[PDB]
Design an enzyme around this catalytic site. Structure first.
Site, short mmCIF file in Angstrom:
data_model
loop_
_atom_site.label_atom_id
_atom_site.label_comp_id
_atom_site.label_asym_id
_atom_site.label_seq_id
_atom_site.Cartn_x
_atom_site.Cartn_y
_atom_site.Cartn_z
CB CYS A 1 -2.82 7.04 1.57
SG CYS A 1 -1.52 6.34 2.61
CD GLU B 1 -3.21 -0.81 0.47
OE1 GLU B 1 -3.37 0.35 0.04
OE2 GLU B 1 -4.05 -1.72 0.29
#
Lengths: 509, 502, 508, 508
Positions: free
Chosen positions: B300, B266
Site C-alpha cells: 500500500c 484503509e
C-alpha cells in the site's frame, strides 16, 4: 406590521438589525436569493426579513473562505486563540440583547436565551487555553538516529449546519474549536432563526475586521435545503458538521461519504430516565419535570421516556401530575414564565399526531395532550402511561413535550429497554446502589454518549465532549479531545542520521 | 499434484493444514460453502483447498460471537492483555513456518514473510501494557457535589476485512487492539490467501481454548464479496475494519453509513518521493529502489511517484538504472533473493497494460517494462520518464513495480503535485533545508497520513498510528490513541450530594 | 549452613553456593566483610555473601557510567525488548525464587511467589511503555518556530530497598528506569543478600546473552556505609530509597545538599475506617488479612482500626474469633497463613510496644505474647481502649499490633486518619454515596493511597504507588511515574529565515 | 522629597499607592514591622514607604489563609478559573500604570515592564481553560468489580517567595496555577520591590472582594530574610515556591526537606550560546546582543557565555563590538532606550569586581568594563575574550551585563563545556546541521531545562514548563503539566461488587 418597526422592540437595533437584513457575509454583506420573513412563535407576528443566499452567492463565499484560510493557517494557534478571546468579550457586551433575540425568534424562555449566549462565551475562554495545548506526542522510534512525531494540521474549510432549537450555542461550539485549530468556517443555520444567525455573524465580523483579518474566516450563507445539500456535495468542504434530524442527517452522512469527505453528526435523541426503588423521590420528581418540559421539550437531550420501578410507579406519576399543573405558561420574555410555545405550527401538528397515535397504540393521557386556545404555538405538556416499552410511537422521536411512562421490575430488562431504540444520545438512572451505578457506566450498562447518575438527561458541561451513538451520528463537540475532529493527524518519521540503508547485495555509488 | 501432498512441502503440516481445510471457525470448525483451491504465484501450482462459508455459516457465526462477547466483556482489560501476551508467544513458536507460508501462498520474499509475522508479535507485546492504560480522564465539574468522568467501553463485534498483500499484519493490528478493548472479532481475508487466514486462526484458537475461552472471540469466515457485503450490511457488526481497494472500500463506507454503523477504511495509495537539489544522492538512490520494487511493488505504501529537481534528475535516473540491473529475482523462500513474483497472472497482464498506456501517453521506458520468461508471475521492475505529472496513468494506482519519474523546478509546485492525486496514504521528501522540512510537515505541506523526511514511503512503526487521508479512508491502526476507534466514548455526570434542584 | 543440606538442593538452581559474590558490574567480586543470612523460622544459617568494599563501590560506579554511554544510544523500544526477556527469565525461575523469598525473608510461600509475579507483570507493562514515553509537541506563539517537550535519562539510578519486599520494589525501579535509558546500582537489605544475588544472576545472564555490558544493572551489597556513600555521591543522579522514615529523612537531606534527585518510599501508619452502614461480612475478613498479612510487616499494613460506636464491640469480637483461626507454621509449608518476624530484634520491638500500650492505658484483647517455638514467632495482637492520640498509636511499629478505636461522626474520624505524620495508605468501608466522594476529595484522606471497601494493601501496577508527608512523596510503577527517572527540557526551535527586530541598531 | 508627593508622578495614585503603604494583606490591610523606603535605581530618589510584616503579622495571616482555604477548596475548579479570568481583566485595565511602576521601582525599560504585566495577563487566560482540564485518568483495574482512578487535590497553602528581576511575572505564574488547583497563597516579594508587591495585591484584593470571597486566598506579607526563613520552616506552608540565588535556595531546600514539605526551586543560571561554522551570522550577532544586555543583563536566562567556532570567532566578536556601541542608554521610562541601570548600587560594585577579576585571571576587555558617569546605577555592557573556559569568573554567576567569549573546535567538547557548570537553566546552539540539532536535544546533548535552536537563551513561552536542572533547583512553572507540583496525587481503588474475600481456611 413588522416587530422591529415598533418602539417597544427598538432594542433589536442594538444588534445591528433592520427591517430587511443581508443574510450573506464573506468579507462583504449580500444575498441575492429569496427574501425570507421570520415570525415570533409566541404570537405569530412578523419580526424582520433576511435576504438568503443564491447559488452564485454560495460559490463566491466558498472561494473567498478558502482564500482567507491561506492567511489564517499561517497564524500561530495561540494568536488564533487571542482572536477567539475577543469574540468572547464581544458576546459579553451583547449578552442581554442577543439572549432576548433568541427568546423572541426561537421561543425559549429568557433565562435560557441568555444562558445559550453564555455557553458560547465560556467555550471561547476555554478555547483560549486550549490554543496553547493542541498537538501530538513525541514518540520514541525503534530506529537509531530517527525521530517519530505526531503532527496535527487544520483540514481547511469547516462547514457548519445548525438547527432551530439551539441557534447560538451549537455554532459557537464548532466555531471556537475550529478557529483555534486553524480552520475557516461557513455557517448555514435554520431558516426560521436567520435573524439570530445574522446577529451573531455581525458580532464576529466586527472582531475580524478590527484585527484586519479577512471576514471570510467566519462566513455566512443563510438558506434552506438547497444550500445545505450543496455543502454536503462540495469537495471544497473538508468537514461538514451537521446538527439536525436523523432522517436528514442520514442523507447528509451518505453524500459526504460518497466524496470521501469528513462528517460530524449530531442527530436525534430518545432519552430515558430510570428511577429505582431506592431512589430519592425528592430528587427524582422535579428532575423528571424540568428535563421533560424544559424548552417546551425541544432539546436534543429532553427526557422522553420515563421508566419507574413497580414499587413507586403510581406515586411518582401522581406527584408528577400535581407538579405539571403548577407549571407557569406564557410569553417567553416574561420574568415568571417557565414554559413557552413550540417553534412552528407544524410542530403543533406533529404533537397532536403523536398523541392521537399513542392512544391508538393503547396509551392513556394522564395529563395535557391538547393544544392551548391562545395565540402562538402553545401545547400542553403531556404525560402518557400504559404503553408497552416497544410501542412504535414510543421508539419514535417527536420534538414535543410528551413523556412516555413505563413500569419495570429488574435492572437487567430496564437497561435493555434503554438501549433497544435507534437513538443513543442521553440517559439517566436515579439510585443510591453503588454496584448498579458502576454497571450502568460499564459495558452492560447504557450505550449512550451521555450516561448520567442522579441528574436528568440534560446534565452536561463545557469540559466534556458532547454527542451520541448509533442513530445520533457518533459526532462529538466542545470538550475533551473533540478538537481532533477538526484537524488531520499525520505520523512523521524523521531521519537525521548520516547512516545509509543496508546494501542487500547491491553496489551503489 | 497438490503441493501439500509433496514431501518437499511437508512443513505445511506443522501449521495444521491438510489437503482440504475448514474455512469457518466460531468455536467449531466447518464450511458448507464453495471449496476453493489456492495457487503458488512462483510456479502456478496448487497448494491446498479451503471450504468457504455458506450463508448459514455466517449467520450462526455472528450469533456465537455476540454470545461470546458477554463473557469476554466481563473480563478485566489487563487479563484480556494476558491472553494477548499468550497470542504473541504462540506466534513466536511458529514464526518461521508461518512466514514461509506467507511466501508460498502470497509471494513475498522470506525475510518479509517472517517480518510480517513479527509485526503481529510486536503489536501483541505493545497491547499488553496498553490494556492497563486505556480509559479517559477525570474532569472537574462546574457543579458542586458532582463528578465528571470520561468512560470508554467496547463497541461489541469488530468485523475485519483484509487484502492479499499483507495477509497477516493488518489483521494482527486490528485483532490485538480490538481484543484488549473488550471486543470480539470476525475475520474475512482475501480468498487467495485463505490458508494464511486458516493457519493464523489455528494458532489463536489454541490460545483461546487452552484458556477455557469461547473460540468465537476471534472468529473466521472465509469467503469473497458476498461475505464482505453481508458484513457491511449487518447491523450486528458494530465496527467494520476494511482494508482493500478504493473502489470497493467506497461502497463499504456507504453501506455502513446507511445503517449508522462504524467503519475503519484503509484504501489505496499513490505515494510520492521528492528529492531536492541539496539531497544526499547516496541516500536517495537506494531509498527509492527499495521503496519502489519492494514486494514486487505490491505494498500500500509502495513508492510509485518520484519527483526529482532538474539539476539532478538525469544523474539520479542513471544511478537508478545501474542499481536496478543488479536486482536479484527468483523464488521468494530462497536466500539472497530480493525480488519475487506478482500475486496473480492477472497482475502480470495489468502490468503490461500500464506499460503500454504509459507509452501511449508519451512516456519513455528507460528500464524494464517486460515480462520475465520463467515459470510464475515474474515481471521486470520498470522505470518510466517523460510523463506529465497530470498523466492519467500516473494518477491511476497499479499494483505492479512501475516507477514514474518527473521533473520539478520549485518547492511550491512539487508540494502541490504530491497533493493533487485522489489518494492520500504516504509521502516523503529528501532534503537538508530546515525550513523546507517544517513547511513539509506543516499546513501548507503534505496532506498525507504518513509524512516522512529522509526516509522512503514505507517508513512506519508500531508506536504510531498507521493510515491516510482523502480517498485512503481516514482510518487508523496500531499506535497512539488509535484504540479509540474500537471503543465508544461516554461523558458521565454523577451527582452524589443531597442538594435538591431549584 | 542450610545450603549444604540435600533438602535445600533447589537453592543451587539459582546459582547460589556456600559463599557467594556480592558485587556485580560485568564481573563478579566483593572484597568487603562477609555476611551470613539466617532463616527466621529456625535461626539457622543458610549461606554467606561477600559484601562490597569501598574500592568495590568505586569501580562499580565508574563501570556503570561507562555502560550508560552505550545503553542511552539504544532505542527505547529495543530497551523494552531487553526488559521483556528479563520478564521471561523470571517466569522460568518463579517457583524457586519465591521459595528463596520465603526461606530468607520469612513471608509465606504464596506471597513469595506472588512477589516474583509482581516483577514479571511490571516488566510486561514496561514493554508497551517503552513505545509511549515522551512529551507533547506544543504550538509556539512565535511564527516559524516549534515548541517541543523532550525527556531524557537522568543517568545513573541508585536503588536502595528494604527487607520486607526484597524483590518487587527493586523490580519496579529496574524495569522503569531501564526503558527510560538509565543504568542502575542496587543495594538491598543486608539480611536479604542471597535474594539480591539470585535476582542479579538472572538479569546478568539476560544482558550477557544480548551482548550488553553488565554494569547496566549493577549490584553492591552492603550496609549503612554503602547507603551513605550513595546518598552523598554526585555520580548518583537519582537515588530511590525504600526503608524507615528516620533514615529516609537523612537520605533526603544528603541528596538535597548536593542538588540531586531523590525518590523516597518510607513508613506508614495506615488506617481502616468502618461506618455503621458498612457490610460487616466484608469488613471483618478484610481487616484481618490486612492486619496480619506478612506478620504485619508490610509498608501498607493496617495498624489503626477505626470502628463506629454502634458496631464497635461486635466487630472486635468477630475479629477475636477470627484471629483464633489463623494457621501459623513454617512459611514454606502449605495451608500456613502466618510465618515468623524477620529478625529476633523485631520481637523485642514487638514486646516493647505492647507493654508501652498498656502503660499508656491500652487493653490487650488478644495475643501480645511470644510463641514458645523456634524462630521469631509472636502472637497477632489486638489492643483496645487507647485514645486516638496515644503515643504508641502514632508510632510505626513493624509488628502485628492492631490499635482499635471508636468514633461517632465522619468529620472527626477523617481528621484522626490525617493527624499522623505518615501518609501512605488508607481505607473506608461504607455504602453512603456522598461520604465516598468526600473521602476522595480535598477534605478527605491526605494519603497517597485512598481506597473504598478494600483494605490498605489495595494497589496494582497500572497506578502510581507511594505516600504523602513523612512517607517521602515518591511514586513507583504506574501512571506517569516514569517522569521521575527522566529530565524534562523545554525546546524552542527556530526554522524560519526571519531576523529579530533591529530596534534601531545597525548590523551586518 | 518622596517622588509620590511630586506632581509628575501622580499616576502612582492610580494604583492605590500613598505616601506610606500597608505591606500586609489577609482580608485586611496592615503591617507592624519595620518601615522600608524603596528607591528608584535610575536616580536614587525615594518613591514611597512600605510597612513590612512583623512576626505577629505573619502568624495571623497564615492562620486566616488556612481558614480561607476551607471555603476556597470547596469551590469548583472551573469556578476558581472564572475568578482567575477576572484577575486577568483587572490587570489589563491597569497594564500601563503598573508597567510604569515596574520600570520606576525595579529599573527595566518600559516595554519590558508592560511585557511582564502582559505575561501575568496571558497565564490567567491560559489557566482558565486549564481549570476545566486538571485531573487524572480512570484506569482499568485487574480486579473484577473494582474501579481504579487517579485523583488530584490541592496541597493547601502555597508560600511564594520571589526576586527583584521579575517582580510581577514570577508571582503571577505561581498564583494563577495554584489558585485554579484549589490552593491559597502567601506572597513575600523582594524588599526593594515592595510597592509592586502591594500594587498587585490591591488589584487582586478587589477581585476577591467583589466576588464575596475571603481576601486571605491571595495573602501578602512584605519582609526580608526573617519572613522568608519562617516560611521555609513553617509546617503550615505545604508548598514553598522559591525564586532567587543559588546560595539561598540551597538553604531553603534543606529547611523544607527537613520537615518533609514540598519545594519548588527556580535558582541561578550561567547560560551559554554556541555558534557553529555553518551558522547564519546575521541571526547570531543580534541574538547574542539582545540576550546578553537585555534588562541590563539581569535575567536568570541572560546569556553569559558565548562559544564561537574557531573559523568565525574574530568576525563575530568584531561585529558584536560595533553593535554594542550602538546600544542606547538612558532612563527606563523613555522611548528608544534599550539599557537601564542595575537594580542596586551593590550590583555595581560586584559588576566592577568581576571585571577586575577577569583581568587578574588573564582576560581582555574588548568593550565596556567601566561605570557610566551619571546619576543612578548605570554600567557599560562588557565583552571579555581570551579567557579559559574553566576560568573561575566564567563559572560564577554575576548579575551584570558581562559576556565571556570562548572559542571551540569540535562539537563534542563544546557540548561538554556547556554542561560543566553547576547551573543548569538555559542554553542555545546556532547551526543548520540536522544531525547536530537532534544530538543537542538528545541524551548526549545539553543538560539544561531550556534547550533552544537558532534562538537565544531567553526564548521561552507560557505554553511550556519553565525551569532548570542541577543547581538551578529542578522546579517547573507555568505550562505543560507543571500544575501537578501544586497538587497531591492519590491512587484510588473502589470495590463496588458484592464479592467477599477468600476465606483462606478461616470461618467467619
Amino acid at each position: 406590521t413588522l416587530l422591529i418597526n415598533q418602539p417597544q422592540y427598538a432594542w433589536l437595533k442594538e444588534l445591528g438589525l433592520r427591517e430587511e437584513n443581508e443574510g450573506v457575509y464573506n468579507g462583504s454583506w449580500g444575498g441575492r436569493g429569496e427574501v425570507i420573513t421570520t415570525y415570533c412563535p409566541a404570537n405569530n407576528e412578523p419580526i424582520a426579513r433576511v435576504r438568503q443566499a443564491s447559488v452564485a452567492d454560495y460559490e463566491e463565499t466558498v472561494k473567498k473562505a478558502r482564500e482567507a484560510w491561506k492567511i489564517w493557517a499561517d497564524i500561530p494557534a495561540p494568536k488564533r486563540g487571542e482572536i477567539v478571546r475577543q469574540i468572547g468579550d464581544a458576546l459579553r457586551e451583547k449578552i442581554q440583547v442577543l439572549g432576548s433575540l433568541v427568546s423572541l425568534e426561537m421561543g425559549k424562555i429568557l433565562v435560557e436565551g441568555v444562558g445559550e449566549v453564555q455557553e458560547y462565551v465560556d467555550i471561547c475562554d476555554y478555547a483560549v487555553g486550549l490554543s496553547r495545548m493542541i498537538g501530538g506526542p513525541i514518540l520514541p522510534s525503534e530506529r537509531s538516529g530517527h525521530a517519530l512525531i505526531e503532527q496535527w494540521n487544520p483540514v481547511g474549510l469547516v462547514g457548519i449546519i445548525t438547527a432551530f432549537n439551539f441557534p447560538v450555542a451549537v455554532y459557537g461550539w464548532n466555531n471556537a474549536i475550529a478557529m483555534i485549530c486553524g480552520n475557516v468556517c461557513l455557517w448555514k443555520g435554520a431558516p426560521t432563526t436567520s435573524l439570530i444567525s445574522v446577529a451573531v455573524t455581525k458580532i464576529i465580523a466586527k472582531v475580524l475586521e478590527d484585527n484586519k483579518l479577512p471576514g471570510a474566516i467566519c462566513s455566512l450563507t443563510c438558506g434552506g435545503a438547497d444550500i445545505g445539500t450543496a455543502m454536503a456535495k462540495d469537495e471544497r468542504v473538508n468537514l461538514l458538521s451537521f446538527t439536525g434530524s436523523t432522517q436528514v442527517g442520514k442523507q447528509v452522512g451518505l453524500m459526504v461519504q460518497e466524496r470521501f469527505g469528513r462528517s460530524l453528526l449530531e442527530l436525534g435523541g430518545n432519552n430515558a430516565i430510570i428511577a429505582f426503588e431506592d431512589a430519592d423521590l425528592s430528587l427524582v420528581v422535579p428532575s423528571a419535570l424540568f428535563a421533560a418540559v424544559g424548552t417546551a421539550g425541544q432539546r436534543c437531550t429532553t427526557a422522553r421516556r420515563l421508566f419507574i420501578h413497580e414499587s413507586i410507579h403510581d406515586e411518582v406519576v401522581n406527584r408528577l401530575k400535581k407538579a405539571y399543573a403548577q407549571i407557569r405558561v406564557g410569553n417567553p420574555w416574561d420574568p415568571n414564565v417557565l414554559y413557552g410555545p413550540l417553534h412552528t405550527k407544524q410542530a403543533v401538528s406533529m404533537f397532536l399526531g403523536a398523541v392521537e397515535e399513542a392512544k391508538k397504540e393503547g396509551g392513556t393521557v394522564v395529563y395535557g395532550g391538547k393544544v392551548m386556545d391562545r395565540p402562538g404555538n402553545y401545547v400542553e405538556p403531556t404525560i402518557v402511561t400504559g404503553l408497552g416499552h416497544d410501542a412504535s410511537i414510543a421508539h419514535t422521536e417527536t420534538f414535543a413535550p410528551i413523556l412516555y411512562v413505563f413500569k419495570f421490575k429488574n435492572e437487567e430488562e430496564v437497561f435493555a429497554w434503554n438501549n433497544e431504540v435507534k437513538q443513543g444520545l442521553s440517559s439517566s438512572i436515579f439510585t443510591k446502589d453503588l454496584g448498579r451505578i458502576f454497571r450502568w457506566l460499564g459495558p452492560k450498562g447504557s450505550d449512550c454518549g451521555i450516561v448520567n447518575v442522579n441528574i436528568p438527561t440534560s446534565g452536561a458541561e463545557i469540559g466534556g465532549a458532547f454527542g451520541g451513538e448509533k442513530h445520533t451520528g457518533g459526532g462529538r463537540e466542545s470538550g475533551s479531545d473533540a478538537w481532533k475532529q477538526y484537524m488531520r493527524r499525520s505520523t512523521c518519521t524523521i531521519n537525521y542520521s548520516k547512516d545509509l540503508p543496508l546494501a542487500q547485495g547491491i553496489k551503489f555509488q
